[PDB]
Amino acid sequence: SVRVMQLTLGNSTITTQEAANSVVAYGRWPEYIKDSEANPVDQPTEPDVAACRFYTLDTVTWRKESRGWWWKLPDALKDMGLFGQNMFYHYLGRAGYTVHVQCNASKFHQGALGVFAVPEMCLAGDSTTHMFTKYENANPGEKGGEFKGSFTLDTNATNPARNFCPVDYLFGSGVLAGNAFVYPHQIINLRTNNCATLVLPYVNSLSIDSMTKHNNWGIAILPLAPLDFATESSTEIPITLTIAPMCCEFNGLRNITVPRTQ
Amino acid sequence: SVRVMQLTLGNSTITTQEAANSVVAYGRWPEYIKDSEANPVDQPTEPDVAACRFYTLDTVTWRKESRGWWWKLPDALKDMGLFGQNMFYHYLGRAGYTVHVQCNASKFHQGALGVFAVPEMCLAGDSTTHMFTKYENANPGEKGGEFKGSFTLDTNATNPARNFCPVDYLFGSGVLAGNAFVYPHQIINLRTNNCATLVLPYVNSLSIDSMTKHNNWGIAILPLAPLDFATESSTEIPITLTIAPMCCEFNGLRNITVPRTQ
Amino acid sequence: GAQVSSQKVGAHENSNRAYGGSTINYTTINYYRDSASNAASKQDFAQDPSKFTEPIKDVLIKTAPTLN
Amino acid sequence: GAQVSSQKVGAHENSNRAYGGSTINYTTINYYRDSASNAASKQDFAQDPSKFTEPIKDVLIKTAPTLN
Amino acid sequence: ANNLPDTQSSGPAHSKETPALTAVETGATNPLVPSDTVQTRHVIQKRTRSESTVESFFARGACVAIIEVDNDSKLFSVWKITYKDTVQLRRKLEFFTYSRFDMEFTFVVTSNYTDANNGHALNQVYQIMYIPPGAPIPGKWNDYTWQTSSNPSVFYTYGAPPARISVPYVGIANAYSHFYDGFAKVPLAGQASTEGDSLYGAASLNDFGSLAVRVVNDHNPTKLTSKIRVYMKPKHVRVWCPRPPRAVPYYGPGVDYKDGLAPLPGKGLTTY
Amino acid sequence: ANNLPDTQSSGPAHSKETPALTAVETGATNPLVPSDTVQTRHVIQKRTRSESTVESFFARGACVAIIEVDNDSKLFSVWKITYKDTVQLRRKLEFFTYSRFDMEFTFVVTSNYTDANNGHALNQVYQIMYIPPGAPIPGKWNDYTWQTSSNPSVFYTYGAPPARISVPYVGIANAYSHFYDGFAKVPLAGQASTEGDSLYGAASLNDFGSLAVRVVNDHNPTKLTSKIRVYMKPKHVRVWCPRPPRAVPYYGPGVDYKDGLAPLPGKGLTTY
Ligand SMILES: COc1ccc(OCc2ccc(COc3c(Cl)cccc3Cl)cc2)c(Cl)c1
Ligand SMILES: COc1ccc(OCc2ccc(COc3c(Cl)cccc3Cl)cc2)c(Cl)c1
């Protein structure tokens, strides 16, 4: 039925008994580069089962006060097994994804989470200096980031944070959040479903790019209807994020990249 | 399924996700007068969409102590939009109906309502004078009336009430209520359904009659199993009644009728 | 090398020329070798919004229950 | 996409060209896609004034008595 | 750019099909039409979406720059090519993530005497030279760079109809990116913080080069100023991935915001 | 736009057919021709009604507005689009109740020095921007609204032949109404008199929007004034329901009158 599914990729399987169908972004399933759209001339590496499998990133907790969370792809998976290895050993890389967000509660809980997949999800910074966010802050990895309820300008001139300041109702980029529904999405309304499943093809203005310099997709999760339970002002339910890269192919092998951190 | 439905008449739509099928009284769907059964010779008016649509009468509240409610048709709809206008402008009128009773609660509530559609639903009065109920009392309109737990004789000779005294177990007419199941009906048992839907054809010993002098159908709602909740001696759930006239045709147009009231 | 297309006549004159003939056609000829120099033809097509309106994996009917 | 119509010659020159040939025709070609950009053809038709002059239900003959 | 479907007449219903009920959690929009929830009549639809096609939406010349030159270094000016110096065209382009089109540039040139009662000059001729990223940039209004042996130049005579030229799709990618979630450099472990640092959301330091404008006539002591307003129109348009439009004021070339963060007015929940 | 019928010869009569007698009470006009009441000869008719066709009657550019701008807020002006600012075209249009046509607008621009012996300015360029009802109206001769990324603009260089553009049938109804016997609002029972009140015979508060005109050049202290005379010609014309023409002077946008109520002169009943 629309509600029961099983996803198998490599050596990993995911089962769900409360789905609300699955979304295939823009109606496009991920695919490899065709010869007619090929650019780099060298033989690509395609790890296949070693990289195209389900990786579970860290679990976040939803509370009445949560504003939202965000992650960047392939960034969030840079340290994930052999996918991360191939990402750092190659100059160029390409991949699609199957994003599976998990969140179960009970029949006496309420709340709705909007799960959006955004191509080129550029976020707003914290200073008066334009495009000032530094690489280390823009790429948090598997832990991702969070949305805020208001904009707060960083004034420390001696030691600028050079970080993002994504305000939730402004979708972290100066647009109204209610219009974010034009992007592939699903809603995890506690009275209806457990999860959200989105299949994302590779989207870019090029056939292949640098995975370290460029993040193709952004995953934004916003509480559309806040978490509430029985009478417990105190309520916490975890949100686990499991993502699997698809049709990975890398070009331009050399020595490994070791990016600067923190 | 037997449980999900959508009813559309004119500019009004009703949806339900917890139905228990629908009853079509005597297996007859409402229809217009055929030439072989026609009586008045003048061209009829058939308002169609302007009169044949869903009209929501006033909501009543069910409590542990409720004895029951009753309404008369077309009486309850006499002030409803263009249906009421056509009713009063014409000497003769005919119509069928789609009665949709609404009552939702929760999985921890109990109670069962018997919804009966009675042709020629004559009720008992309050005095020793036979057939003494006056027109104004017999025709309450959209607010309808209520059943009582016992018969109480009106003794005020100076100012007789000239009203009905419908005792519930006597079905308000001197017959046992348990036998009222011989009339088209449905039961709204809180653990099973939200509503009751009955399609009533025009029933009478004539093809067309005076809608102001005569009520063709009566709607009786009796608590078969009283309302009860968790441990709240205090419980109230509303019962909304939505009715839509069908195949309306009127004959004998003249000046408007303005009946005496109160 | 002339391209002859027909116009979508809005307001019609009290003429038969307003309803037929070359009088409701327009002529075009490209003078430049580079396609960039060309004007816009404006005979543009449409498409199905489904990729945005219903990017669902398992296709569903509006009459039928969405959650099944 | 050229439209070739003939002119209604008023004053005639002492030529045979004033009475025949392409010399009494004029040529037209639309350059714009929108019909609004077009000039007026001016080959406009007429109609019966009856809707104004005789909007009578029961048609009457002038020779015959109007009031009958 | 076509027709809309006709409305078919629809009568009453009493069925198990309920198109009015749905579940938006799936991520889909309910494709209902009037006849699904009310009784409709047959209407022969004659309206079309001819003017809302991606092409017609952009088929307008929008101002992207106002270059100024004072013919008394101001004897010449340089404008770094961009569509972000103005807000109107920028906001329309940003309804999409990627685009691919040709461009038509029209130049409206105006000039005037600064002094109401002083100076005089003969008719001016302007040279608008395109300097592709890499070509030498003029240091003086009359140095060797203005020979344009390879750079495309446009010589405009004051008073003539606005100059106009077409440019093909010149991107180095398969489409123009309106948004680039990345950097041009990756800072490597071990290098000084000064190292490997670049702007967020920036690609090349010099994407499309710039325009160098000057008056070719010998300057007279007279005080004169000229302004070249650049209008650009995307033609032969294709766009990908729609995005919600900009709701708050722009704050630079990025998606940064600062000032008008409260765009919506107050309105009663139960007030019509 | 065609031929007239020939006159057929007609001889004497002595019959029971009397076309001369009629009864105008019916609401009809007696369709007599000369041969009905007199003896006629055969005349081959060569006259036609080519110039009185609805199209030829309106095929002339009529002045509908004179917009003025002083290049020393007058640096720019706004004209609410209408055909009622002038009387000549208005009176011709009002021979009919409804109309449907395309429009051709020609702009004649003139300018001059206010001072006979002072000031000087270089050739002016004008921008005529159409602001459709809803679009932002310019507050300054140089604010962001003049970027016209979507509004249609016309840039005219002084001295060039008059500018000219065509506009399609833009009505929201199936025809333009020259007369509207109604209101835009219905006052409801119970509401304050201030409520539900609107002008008699008025439809939208902003029917067709307006034109914003300005000189693009930087203004010099010199005193200059320009005037843009707007000429409009209905082309591809269709008209419905004839009405008697305006006999007394116009008094506003409505059918109101006040002054020249006695249009006819005196003449003796028996004076030729
Ligand atoms: C996504 O939106 C875009 C993408 C690219 C753009 O600019 C690309 C660009 C590249 C070269 C030239 C050079 O064009 C010119 C030449 Cl050859 C000669 C003279 C004058 C000009 Cl003006 C002009 C624009 C703009 Cl403005 C918007
Ligand atoms: C019954 O008689 C009528 C009906 C409508 C009329 O005006 C309708 C109308 C609507 C838009 C425009 C806008 O036209 C323009 C444009 Cl796009 C660009 C530049 C200049 C102009 Cl000028 C002009 C006129 C007039 Cl004048 C007479």
GROMACS .gro file of C-alpha atoms in nm, chain E residues 57 60-63 86-89 92 108-120 124 158-162 224-225 227 229 231, chain F residues 71 117-125 127 136 141-142 144-152 155 157-158 214 216-222:
model
   68
  717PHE     CA    1   0.775   3.671  -1.888
  720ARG     CA    2   1.131   4.304  -2.177
  721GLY     CA    3   1.440   4.526  -2.174
  722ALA     CA    4   1.536   4.585  -1.810
  723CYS     CA    5   1.793   4.838  -1.688
  746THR     CA    6   1.963   4.651  -1.010
  747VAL     CA    7   1.676   4.468  -0.837
  748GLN     CA    8   1.389   4.424  -1.084
  749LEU     CA    9   1.542   4.192  -1.344
  752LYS     CA   10   1.259   3.775  -1.192
  768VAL     CA   11   2.034   5.464  -2.414
  769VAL     CA   12   2.287   5.750  -2.404
  770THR     CA   13   2.211   6.095  -2.258
  771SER     CA   14   2.438   6.396  -2.200
  772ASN     CA   15   2.414   6.760  -2.089
  773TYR     CA   16   2.603   7.076  -1.997
  774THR     CA   17   2.662   7.102  -1.626
  775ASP     CA   18   2.663   7.479  -1.662
  776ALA     CA   19   2.349   7.661  -1.767
  777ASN     CA   20   2.544   7.946  -1.925
  778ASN     CA   21   2.890   7.811  -1.997
  779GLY     CA   22   3.082   7.600  -2.244
  780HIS     CA   23   3.004   7.442  -2.578
  784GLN     CA   24   3.001   6.338  -2.912
  818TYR     CA   25   2.509   6.104  -2.981
  819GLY     CA   26   2.150   6.155  -3.096
  820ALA     CA   27   2.126   5.835  -3.302
  821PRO     CA   28   1.872   5.567  -3.209
  822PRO     CA   29   1.990   5.360  -2.908
  884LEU     CA   30   2.987   6.781  -1.949
  885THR     CA   31   2.856   6.452  -1.818
  887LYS     CA   32   2.527   5.850  -1.884
  889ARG     CA   33   2.191   5.324  -1.942
  891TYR     CA   34   1.916   4.755  -2.098
 1003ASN     CA   35   1.320   6.985  -1.706
 1049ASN     CA   36   1.865   8.470  -2.399
 1050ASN     CA   37   1.956   8.218  -2.131
 1051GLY     CA   38   2.060   7.859  -2.083
 1052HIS     CA   39   2.160   7.576  -2.313
 1053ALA     CA   40   2.106   7.201  -2.316
 1054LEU     CA   41   2.213   6.900  -2.523
 1055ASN     CA   42   1.950   6.697  -2.715
 1056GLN     CA   43   1.687   6.539  -2.487
 1057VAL     CA   44   1.574   6.177  -2.464
 1059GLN     CA   45   1.099   5.790  -2.152
 1068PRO     CA   46   0.449   5.099  -0.863
 1073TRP     CA   47   1.212   6.134  -1.189
 1074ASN     CA   48   1.490   5.887  -1.111
 1076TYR     CA   49   1.382   5.243  -0.915
 1077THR     CA   50   1.048   5.231  -1.104
 1078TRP     CA   51   1.211   5.363  -1.421
 1079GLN     CA   52   1.400   5.034  -1.468
 1080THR     CA   53   1.090   4.904  -1.655
 1081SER     CA   54   1.187   4.538  -1.632
 1082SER     CA   55   0.823   4.447  -1.708
 1083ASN     CA   56   0.639   4.770  -1.789
 1084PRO     CA   57   0.651   4.869  -2.159
 1087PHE     CA   58   1.245   5.600  -2.539
 1089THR     CA   59   1.504   6.108  -2.896
 1090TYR     CA   60   1.406   6.472  -2.954
 1146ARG     CA   61   1.027   6.213  -1.793
 1148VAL     CA   62   1.625   6.099  -1.906
 1149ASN     CA   63   1.909   6.356  -1.933
 1150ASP     CA   64   2.050   6.510  -1.616
 1151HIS     CA   65   1.868   6.841  -1.567
 1152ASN     CA   66   2.067   7.159  -1.620
 1153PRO     CA   67   1.971   7.485  -1.435
 1154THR     CA   68   1.837   7.604  -1.773
   0.00000   0.00000   0.00000
